[PDB]
Each structure stands twice: as structure tokens, then as C-alpha cells.
Amino acid sequence: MNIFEMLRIDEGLRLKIYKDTEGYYTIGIGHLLTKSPSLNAAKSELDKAIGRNCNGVITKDEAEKLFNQDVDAAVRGILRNAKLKPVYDSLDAVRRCAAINMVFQMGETGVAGFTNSLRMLQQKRWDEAAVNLAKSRWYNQTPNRAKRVITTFRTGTWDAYK
Ligand SMILES: C=CCOc1ccccc1F
């Protein structure tokens, strides 16, 4: 297991424009296109992202390339953020995957606001961090995915994904 396999499980793969759990137009392995209600706006974002006129449909290779870009962007956002980087650098490799997963789903600004959870994680207070992480809109709205991520932070294993 690695961050790509973990997020591929959590996000799935769809080659045509779909809606995420919040109702926003998305494609591929969880690539957000726009928060606008306009499908045309989403299609315009897609064509810009891929570099051709896609008509709302991409190939598996294109989905995987977008996914690589999106994972890298999440990592870069962690490493550029003064609140996230010290916590990330304190974690082992498996827990770093859980951190990237959260930033992929909610963005660096949103995750950087999880101030108390971040402190507990940096202190390696795993059970307390897990309890605190579940006291969130994130957990209530996507509980099965949040439970897998939280279990990864709690245990430092891939048990929730096996
Ligand atoms: C608040 C939970 C997410 O945890 C992290 C996210 C990004 C970087 C480091 C982390 F520990």
C-alpha cells in the first residue's frame, strides 16, 4: 500500500463527469472540476486540465495523470504550509499517507484548521487524535472514508484498507 493505492480505493475511478459527495462536478480519481452548478463550466475546466476538447469524457491514462498531479499538489501544499509541515515531518510513512489523504479531500487550508488534532498527532497521542478527528463535519458527512483514514492515524497500519 501507498498513497496512490489508498486514494484510488477511497475515490474510485470514473471516466465521465460525475458529482462528488457534496454535489460538485468531478472526474477521474476524485478530481474536482468546479463548485459552480454549471456543467458547461465544469466541461471548460476539464478541457483546460487535459489540453483537448473532451466533451466530459477522459481516458484512464488521463485520469491517472490528473491523479498524479493532484497527489503531488497535496504534498506540495503540506510542505509549503507552516502549520502542516512540522506535523507531517513528525509522522511515519503510513501516517503521512493519511495526512495526504485528508489534504487531497479537503485542501490544505481546511486541514490546517484542524489545530487541536494536528497537535495531538505531533504529540503521537494516537487514540486522542482519533477521537478528536471524528468530531468533525468531515467524519459526519463521509464516515466510512473518515473511519479508514482515522484508523490509519490511530494504528499506523494499512488494516482499514486490507
Ligand atoms: C489534522 C489531521 C491531518 O493531519 C495532517 C495533515 C497534513 C499534514 C500533517 C498532518 F498531520
Side-chain angles (χ1 to χ4, degrees):
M1 206 91 56
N2 59 57
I3 182 57
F4 296 93
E5 294 185 10
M6 182 197 205
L7 277 167
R8 170 65 177 79
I9 289 165
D10 284 333
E11 303 286 342
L13 172 64
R14 289 165 183 91
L15 300 187
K16 175 285 178 272
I17 292 180
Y18 65 100
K19 291 184 174 180
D20 73 7
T21 68
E22 303 288 341
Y24 297 132
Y25 290 122
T26 305
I27 200 166
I29 308 167
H31 181 82
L32 172 68
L33 291 166
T34 182
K35 293 188 182 189
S36 162
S38 163
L39 180 58
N40 283 338
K43 287 172 167 182
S44 289
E45 291 299 305
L46 178 61
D47 291 354
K48 170 167 60 84
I50 305 295
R52 68 183 179 84
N53 288 318
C54 294
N55 192 31
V57 178
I58 60 174
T59 69
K60 185 169 180 283
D61 281 352
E62 291 168 338
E64 293 172 339
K65 185 165 184 179
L66 284 180
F67 182 46
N68 200 149
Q69 293 177 352
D70 292 341
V71 171
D72 202 57
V75 175
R76 286 198 309 273
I78 288 166
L79 296 176
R80 284 201 261 281
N81 186 284
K83 293 186 61 183
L84 300 178
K85 181 175 190 293
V87 187
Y88 186 79
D89 286 344
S90 78
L91 296 169
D92 57 275
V94 176
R95 293 186 172 94
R96 285 179 179 160
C97 289
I100 299 163
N101 193 305
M102 292 189 72
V103 173
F104 187 101
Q105 184 181 0
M106 285 169 281
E108 72 155 287
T109 60
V111 179
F114 279 58
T115 303
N116 302 317
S117 304
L118 288 167
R119 174 184 314 110
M120 294 174 194
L121 290 168
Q122 186 154 15
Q123 292 173 149
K124 304 190 174 302
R125 296 158 59 195
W126 307 126
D127 285 3
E128 289 169 282
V131 168
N132 187 261
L133 282 164
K135 299 175 178 166
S136 61
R137 179 174 189 278
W138 170 59
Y139 176 86
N140 284 101
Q141 302 302 130
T142 55
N144 284 332
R145 198 252 188 79
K147 282 166 182 184
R148 291 192 290 277
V149 174
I150 291 171
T151 292
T152 308
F153 275 130
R154 187 177 55 82
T155 68
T157 77
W158 291 114
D159 284 357
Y161 289 85
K162 290 169 135 219

